[PDB]
Every structure is written in C-alpha cells, then in structure tokens.
Design an enzyme around this catalytic site. Structure first.
Site, PDB file in Angstrom:
ATOM      1  N   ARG A 253       2.238  65.761  -2.855  1.00  0.00           N
ATOM      2  CA  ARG A 253       2.687  66.658  -4.048  1.00  0.00           C
ATOM      3  C   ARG A 253       1.638  66.547  -4.907  1.00  0.00           C
ATOM      4  O   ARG A 253       1.649  67.385  -5.880  1.00  0.00           O
ATOM      5  CB  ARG A 253       3.954  66.455  -4.333  1.00  0.00           C
ATOM      6  CG  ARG A 253       4.592  65.007  -4.964  1.00  0.00           C
ATOM      7  CD  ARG A 253       5.787  64.882  -5.370  1.00  0.00           C
ATOM      8  NE  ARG A 253       6.070  63.500  -6.099  1.00  0.00           N
ATOM      9  CZ  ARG A 253       6.438  62.619  -5.158  1.00  0.00           C
ATOM     10  NH1 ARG A 253       6.657  62.802  -3.881  1.00  0.00           N
ATOM     11  NH2 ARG A 253       6.794  61.433  -5.845  1.00  0.00           N
ATOM     12  N   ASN A 254       0.922  65.431  -5.159  1.00  0.00           N
ATOM     13  CA  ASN A 254      -0.050  65.021  -6.195  1.00  0.00           C
ATOM     14  C   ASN A 254      -1.592  65.272  -5.914  1.00  0.00           C
ATOM     15  O   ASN A 254      -2.550  64.935  -6.715  1.00  0.00           O
ATOM     16  CB  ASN A 254       0.141  63.602  -6.916  1.00  0.00           C
ATOM     17  CG  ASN A 254       1.713  63.776  -7.574  1.00  0.00           C
ATOM     18  OD1 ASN A 254       2.118  65.055  -8.211  1.00  0.00           O
ATOM     19  ND2 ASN A 254       2.369  62.608  -7.540  1.00  0.00           N
TER      20      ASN A 254
ATOM     21  N   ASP B 133      -2.769  63.215 -10.990  1.00  0.00           N
ATOM     22  CA  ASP B 133      -1.554  62.623 -11.436  1.00  0.00           C
ATOM     23  C   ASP B 133      -1.333  61.295 -11.802  1.00  0.00           C
ATOM     24  O   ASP B 133      -0.413  60.823 -12.326  1.00  0.00           O
ATOM     25  CB  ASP B 133      -0.148  63.106 -10.677  1.00  0.00           C
ATOM     26  CG  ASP B 133       1.107  63.348 -11.847  1.00  0.00           C
ATOM     27  OD1 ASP B 133       1.384  64.512 -12.181  1.00  0.00           O
ATOM     28  OD2 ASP B 133       1.745  62.286 -11.802  1.00  0.00           O
TER      29      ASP B 133
ATOM     30  N   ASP C 199       1.667  56.776  -8.699  1.00  0.00           N
ATOM     31  CA  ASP C 199       2.395  57.871  -8.198  1.00  0.00           C
ATOM     32  C   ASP C 199       1.613  58.835  -7.305  1.00  0.00           C
ATOM     33  O   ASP C 199       1.731  59.999  -7.478  1.00  0.00           O
ATOM     34  CB  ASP C 199       2.586  58.689  -9.674  1.00  0.00           C
ATOM     35  CG  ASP C 199       3.672  59.856  -9.253  1.00  0.00           C
ATOM     36  OD1 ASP C 199       4.478  59.633  -8.333  1.00  0.00           O
ATOM     37  OD2 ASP C 199       3.631  60.813 -10.111  1.00  0.00           O
TER      38      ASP C 199
HETATM   39  C1  LIG Z   1      -0.528  84.303 -11.076  1.00  0.00           C
HETATM   40  N1  LIG Z   1      -0.334  83.200 -10.441  1.00  0.00           N
HETATM   41  C2  LIG Z   1      -0.043  82.027 -10.613  1.00  0.00           C
HETATM   42  C3  LIG Z   1       0.369  81.226  -9.599  1.00  0.00           C
HETATM   43  N2  LIG Z   1      -0.295  81.360  -8.299  1.00  0.00           N
HETATM   44  C4  LIG Z   1      -0.247  80.164  -7.194  1.00  0.00           C
HETATM   45  C5  LIG Z   1      -0.347  78.761  -7.805  1.00  0.00           C
HETATM   46  C6  LIG Z   1       0.902  78.112  -8.076  1.00  0.00           C
HETATM   47  C7  LIG Z   1       0.751  76.759  -8.608  1.00  0.00           C
HETATM   48  C8  LIG Z   1      -0.413  76.269  -8.878  1.00  0.00           C
HETATM   49  C9  LIG Z   1      -0.302  74.714  -9.043  1.00  0.00           C
HETATM   50  C10 LIG Z   1       0.802  73.767  -8.934  1.00  0.00           C
HETATM   51  N3  LIG Z   1       0.095  72.660  -9.585  1.00  0.00           N
HETATM   52  C11 LIG Z   1      -0.993  72.855  -9.958  1.00  0.00           C
HETATM   53  N4  LIG Z   1      -1.876  72.006 -10.638  1.00  0.00           N
HETATM   54  C12 LIG Z   1      -3.147  72.331 -10.774  1.00  0.00           C
HETATM   55  N5  LIG Z   1      -3.849  73.563 -10.386  1.00  0.00           N
HETATM   56  C13 LIG Z   1      -2.738  74.432  -9.936  1.00  0.00           C
HETATM   57  C14 LIG Z   1      -1.437  74.157  -9.678  1.00  0.00           C
HETATM   58  N6  LIG Z   1      -4.151  71.294 -11.398  1.00  0.00           N
HETATM   59  C15 LIG Z   1      -3.744  70.033 -11.825  1.00  0.00           C
HETATM   60  C16 LIG Z   1      -3.511  68.771 -11.066  1.00  0.00           C
HETATM   61  C17 LIG Z   1      -2.645  67.591 -11.789  1.00  0.00           C
HETATM   62  C18 LIG Z   1      -1.616  67.287 -10.903  1.00  0.00           C
HETATM   63  C19 LIG Z   1      -0.382  67.837 -10.511  1.00  0.00           C
HETATM   64  O1  LIG Z   1       0.420  68.440 -11.416  1.00  0.00           O
HETATM   65  N7  LIG Z   1       0.210  67.899  -9.168  1.00  0.00           N
HETATM   66  C20 LIG Z   1       1.283  68.973  -8.879  1.00  0.00           C
HETATM   67  C21 LIG Z   1       0.856  70.336  -8.618  1.00  0.00           C
HETATM   68  C22 LIG Z   1       1.037  71.495  -9.781  1.00  0.00           C
HETATM   69  C23 LIG Z   1      -1.394  76.859  -8.110  1.00  0.00           C
HETATM   70  C24 LIG Z   1      -1.587  78.141  -7.665  1.00  0.00           C
HETATM   71  C25 LIG Z   1      -1.058  82.508  -8.048  1.00  0.00           C
HETATM   72  C26 LIG Z   1      -1.537  83.183  -9.148  1.00  0.00           C
END
Ligand SMILES: CN1CCN(Cc2ccc(-c3cn4c5nc(ncc35)NCCCCC(=O)NCCC4)cc2)CC1
Ligand SMILES: [Cl-]
Ligand SMILES: [Cl-]
Ligand SMILES: [Cl-]
Ligand SMILES: [Cl-]
Length: 260
Positions: free
Chosen positions: A142-143, A156, A138
């Site tokens: 995006r991942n 992921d 996968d």
């Molecule tokens: C108060 N606020 C909240 C929102 N903020 C901005 C923000 C919003 C979303 C993300 C975010 C999104 N994804 C994330 N995945 C991880 N960390 C952060 C995010 N680690 C795990 C990775 C594992 C694989 C995965 O699932 N890949 C898809 C990405 C999904 C980070 C910052 C600002 C402050």
C-alpha cells in the site's frame, strides 16, 4: 528548516486522495513551472518540540535521498501543522493496482516476470535506505508507489500488525532486519495480487501464531524458489535473515532465469 521548508504560498491544495491524510496539490517550483504533488498532513504532539525535531531531522536527510526506486522529498510547508510534499503519481499505490489487475477494464493480468520486477524495484529501494541505516518501519504494498514509467518506488518511510516482525511485536524494537520481514510480506502481497496476509488469523492472534513457528503460506502459483526468498525474510532470529542487497540480487537472478 533552511533546506526543506517551502513557503506555504507556493502550495495550492485540492481533493483528498486518502485518509493524518493525503491531498492533491500543485507546487510552484523555482523554474516558474508548477508540479503536481501529494501532500501528507502530519498530526504531531506539539506539547514539546521533541517530535518536530525528529520530523525536520529526517526530512533534511530524506530530501537528499536520490534513487529511482525511492520516493523523492520536495520539502515541507507549515500552516502550526507541518505537511510533507511528495511527487504525485497518477498510477497510485501498488496494492490497489494489483487488485485492479484481477478485474476487466483495469490493467491486464500481471505476468510473473512483471511481478518479480516489482519486487526488485522495492528491494533496490530498500537497499538504498539500508545502506544509509535509514529504517522504513512501515513497508507494505500500500506504501509502494508506481512511477509514470511503471517502476516501483518505496514511500511513507520516516516521520499494521501483520507486517511487523516477531521481535518488534514483543520487544518493540526496530532494525533493518525488521524491514526485511515486512519486505517478505510485501512480496507475498504481490505474489497473491493483493491478498491480505494470514487469512483466518485475526490481528490479536498474530504473536502466538508466529511464536509457534507458523508463517505465511505459499501461494498456489508461486515458485518454490520465490517462496524460499520470502520465507528467509521471516526467520525467527533477525540475524538469520538476509540483507536487502542479498535479496535484491536473488530476485534479479531469478527474474533473469525467466523468458520474456
Ligand atoms: C481527479 N482525480 C483524482 C483521483 N485520481 C486517482 C488517484 C487517486 C489516488 C492517488 C494516490 C493515492 N496515494 C497517492 N500518493 C501519491 N500520489 C498519488 C496518490 N504520492 C505520495 C506517496 C507517499 C506515500 C503514500 O501516501 N502511499 C499511499 C497512497 C496514497 C493517485 C491517483 C484520478 C484523478
Ligand atoms: Cl491552498
Ligand atoms: Cl521521486
Ligand atoms: Cl484478495
Ligand atoms: Cl497465510
């Protein structure tokens, strides 16, 4: 379980980061300090312990993965739903970042040197998993996650038609050379700064499209040398495709042949 399991009480959940689904949280560690985490809820078929066996199996292996360009597994928590505990990365996924890059206020126009470095990071990460015969299944921009030092790590993996290799569409088989195919598509996403693969082609058209020998087209500003590496990832015979350790060195070499 003894290795990967974490007591649910050490975990506090918050807002949704994306939709199973992802949620923010705080993991209380053994040193007393609390760490910011992303919690991926997993919906499995609990009609049998089959899917959970394969779940806790990889997780034990994934927790032992140690590489700067590969995401870290902190553990798993149970509610009876499992939940993967990963490091929170505030810079988010690379795909959204690329898109933002093309907007004012958002990050500056990413130069080519920085774009290749993204590819190298991912290639190094995939090279690590490949050396351990661990499939991703996968891989996509995006991942791919940005660390606080702006280095990319893959995520992921373990536990999207336009990324799936041609052999994996028909035969429904997966090898590391299938990940290489997706890695080439990821390179295309990066080189186009967030474009969706195969504009004009719907998902239900992808097999006949590829089967007829058509591939992702070369972006306007993309070097012939960089598109060669991408193209080699989509060769029809999985054996004709290069390994991640070859791709990685190709990209490192090309990047070094550029100025700062
Ligand atoms: C108060 N606020 C909240 C929102 N903020 C901005 C923000 C919003 C979303 C993300 C975010 C999104 N994804 C994330 N995945 C991880 N960390 C952060 C995010 N680690 C795990 C990775 C594992 C694989 C995965 O699932 N890949 C898809 C990405 C999904 C980070 C910052 C600002 C402050
Ligand atoms: Cl909670
Ligand atoms: Cl990590
Ligand atoms: Cl676009
Ligand atoms: Cl295209």
């Amino acid at each position: 379980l003894e290795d990967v399991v974490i007591d649910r009480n050490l975990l506090i959940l918050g807002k949704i980061l994306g939709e199973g689904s992802v949620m923010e949280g705080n993991l209380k560690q053994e040193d007393g300090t609390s760490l910011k985490v992303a919690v991926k809820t997993m919906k499995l078929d609990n009609s049998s312990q089959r899917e959970i066996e394969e779940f806790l199996s990889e997780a034990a292996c994934m927790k032992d993965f140690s590489h700067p360009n590969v995401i870290r597994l902190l553990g798993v928590c149970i509610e009876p739903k499992p939940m993967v505990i990963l490091p929170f990365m505030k810079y988010g996924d690379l795909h959204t970042y690329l898109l933002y890059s093309r907007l004012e206020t958002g990050p500056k126009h990413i130069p080519l040197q920085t774009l290749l470095k993204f590819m190298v990071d991912i290639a190094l990460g995939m090279e690590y998993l490949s050396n351990r015969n661990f499939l991703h299944r996968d891989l996509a921009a995006r991942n791919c996650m940005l660390r606080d030092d702006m280095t990319v790590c893959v995520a992921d993996f373990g536990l999207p038609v336009k990324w799936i290799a041609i052999e994996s569409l028909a035969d429904r088989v997966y090898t590391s050379k299938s990940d290489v195919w997706a890695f080439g598509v990821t390179m295309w996403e990066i080189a186009t700064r967030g474009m969706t693969p195969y504009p004009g082609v719907q998902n239900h058209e992808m097999y006949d499209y590829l089967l007829h020998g058509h591939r992702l087209k070369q972006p306007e500003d993309c070097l012939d040398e960089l598109y060669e590496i991408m193209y080699s990832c989509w060769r029809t015979d999985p054996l004709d495709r290069p390994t991640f350790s070859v791709l990685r060195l190709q990209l490192e070499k090309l990047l070094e042949s550029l100025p700062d």
